[PDB]
Amino acid sequence: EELPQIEIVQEGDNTTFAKPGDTVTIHYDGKLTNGKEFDSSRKRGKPFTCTVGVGQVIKGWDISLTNNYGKGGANLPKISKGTKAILTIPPNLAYGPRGIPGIIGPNETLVFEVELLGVN
């Protein structure tokens, strides 16, 4: 079963974990596998707040931030509040064959360097 890959750069508090319906606040840089940046909250000067686990972000983000809607998965570490991680998300858990014209091409793997600042 398809899952994003998660590299834990530095662990957070190891006790606060988002569940579906929670709001999270996160800084990120989104790049293609070739290092070309397609988006970033940091250059925007403000972190990104979203509701997780309910399809209001790409599935790869939902799975990563909620640890597969609480179900976990093989080699899928939990991301606690304060954690720095790198999420690598296959196209089927992102924008698929369709992509986003002029921003993300077809069947693109996305790499997000993230810091989870807040959970609820």
Author numbering: 3 to 122
What's written in the study?
The 12-kDa FK506-binding protein (FKBP12) is a ubiquitously expressed peptidyl-prolyl isomerase with considerable homology between fungal pathogens and is thus a prime candidate for future targeting efforts to generate a panfungal strategy. PPIase proteins all catalyze the cis/trans isomerization of peptide bonds N terminal to proline residues in polypeptide chains. In addition to its role as a PPIase, FKBP12 is a member of the immunophilin family and is the target of the immunosuppressive drugs FK506 and rapamycin.
Interestingly, initial attempts to obtain crystals of the protein-FK506 complex failed, as the intermolecular interaction appeared to be strongly favored, leading to the production of the same apo crystal forms. Thus, we generated a P104G mutation in C. albicans FKBP12 and crystallized and obtained the apo FKBP12(P104G) structure to 2.0 Å. Strikingly, this structure did not harbor the self-catalysis-like interaction.
